[PDB]
Amino acid sequence: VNSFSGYLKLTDNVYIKNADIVEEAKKVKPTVVVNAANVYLKHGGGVAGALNKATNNAMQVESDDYIATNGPLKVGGSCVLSGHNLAKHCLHVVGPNVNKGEDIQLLKSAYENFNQHEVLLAPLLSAGIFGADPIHSLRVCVDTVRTNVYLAVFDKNLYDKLVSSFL
């Protein structure tokens, strides 16, 4: 049993809710919240910008030190950093950004990072300002992630479309 509330069950292991991932993280304090990161961990907008704002920029400060030491992530890769006031840990995962021409096949590799964590709160990777089709992202999620994932979809119209079109 876990504290995630109001989710629709899509499969054995994937759950979905119309919710602001920031507000959901603040309320559940999950072990892992996933950030929709870029390779530079520059949390300017979209989900990343929102999560970072909720940490009063502490996520960005920590991220800048990480990059200065380790260099950029790979598209499809991830790193575990602090969850600050939102979660125990933040898994920063880089999905391909279609508005940069990145290969959409890398989306499966990005979701594979979730399998290193038993339970996660997450957005749909490569959705929103990353330019991919969220219906496709949900399909890849379901077909790749085997651990227990609680997906937060900010837009109600999109949430309803994702549920109603789910096979």
Ligand SMILES: O=C(Nc1ccc(C(=O)N[C@H]2c3cccc(O)c3C[C@@H]2C(=O)O)cc1)NC1CC1
């Ligand atoms: O701003 C906020 N929350 C806030 C929450 C989510 C987003 C956002 O863009 N999410 C989408 C995104 C962005 C980038 C890549 C992606 O794959 C996705 C899928 C995500 C989705 O479809 O849900 C933006 C803002 N809270 C403050 C207190 C009011």
